[model samples]
Target: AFTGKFEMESEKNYDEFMKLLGISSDVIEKARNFKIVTEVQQDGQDFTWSQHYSGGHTMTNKFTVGKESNIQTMGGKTFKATVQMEGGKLVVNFPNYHQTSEIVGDKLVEVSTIGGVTYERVSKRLA
Candidate 1:
């Protein structure tokens, strides 16, 4: 088991991260009512990580990373995301809008003509 602390550049970066995850505005308003955490399980290792916020609710998500193609199934829905490594970064292209996002560290960074967004690590614990 392990634990760590992470901080974002700003609260705005954290908000953008939620947006990128498709979290709703209503949920944002109830941020205090939700708890978010991340868990990672590798081929030879078994561990669980959690991030807790000063909130009143519980939230959970499952994620998988792949080198080429990836599939995600959530809430009875299935989605596919493709990834490619470029310039020492992993680029994930969402199949829905053909939009691309980059992953670095424990956060996802994306830039477009419209603007740029970043998701900073808030906190993490592993066990």
Candidate 2:
């Protein structure tokens, strides 16, 4: 039942993660203070997400738990991932990355692990 809006309070290894994703240096440089925000509306196993970027680009999509969905990156590159709720976290695996998101305390914690390094984004609820 946790939804509505959120923003990442902090992130660790963000640049490295972006590098792994093959994001352009220009974009990553500009995203230094992006303060990524996410708005989600969850109903049962379906979730609609609105992610806002500081560069005026928004990624909006809906996905259902346990079902495969196509996700496109900002540069138009696409991939398929199956959304799954495992234990208390939501997990989805991509070709070379893994995303695990969950709520910890009063913040939303999103983890991206690639190769052997892991990137974390801790988001807080809006006031």
Candidate 3:
């Protein structure tokens, strides 16, 4: 299950990916080293995913598998999204990008793609 805590270990192509989302360079630079902590609570098909970012910004979204839910983005914007499971990967589409998350070995790997740019983040489980 995805009911555990994890912390960001590394990332790739993040700057370019965020740039596609129209994020400012200064904010992106500051967020480069932000060790985001994610905690997931899963009960069957229901899940509560929370992430703690730098500067005391945290986002929590609760949704059921295969159902549309109101999800909030990192920029504090809300939108309707459906969280789906493709094989073992949890997939979701944000307004600007598509993201897929899966557990590989002892780490949680997430990849976000926007147009041609793909940003990957690997997080190690903490608890």
- Minimum summed lDDT over a 10-residue window in model 3 is located at 69-78
Q: Please write out the lDDT profile of model 1 over residues 27-121, one tens digit for every residue.
A: 44444334344343333222222333445343333333353223332111345565444553334554223323334555534443113444332
Relative to the true structure, candidate 1 has a C-alpha RMSD (angstroms) of: 6.6
How much is 119 displaced in model 2, in angstroms? 0.7
Candidate 3 error regions (>4 Å):
22-30, 93-96
What are the TM-scores, per candidate, against the unseen true structure?
Answer: 0.39, 0.83, 0.82
Using lDDT as the measure, the top candidate is 3
What order do you get sorting by TM-score, best first? 2, 3, 1
lDDT of 3 by residue, 27-109 (tens): 46656877667788989888788877777767688777888746655554566778889876888776566888899988888
| TM-score, prediction 1 | 0.39
Q: What value does the lDDT take at residue 34 in candidate 1? A: 46
Clash totals for all models, in order? 3, 0, 0
Pull out the clashing pairs in model 2: none
Q: Is candidate 1 or candidate 2 better by TM-score?
A: 2
Ranking by lDDT: 3, 2, 1
lDDT of 2 by residue, 101-126 (tens): 78888878878788768888777898
Deviation from native of the Cα of residue 97 in model 3, angstroms: 2.9
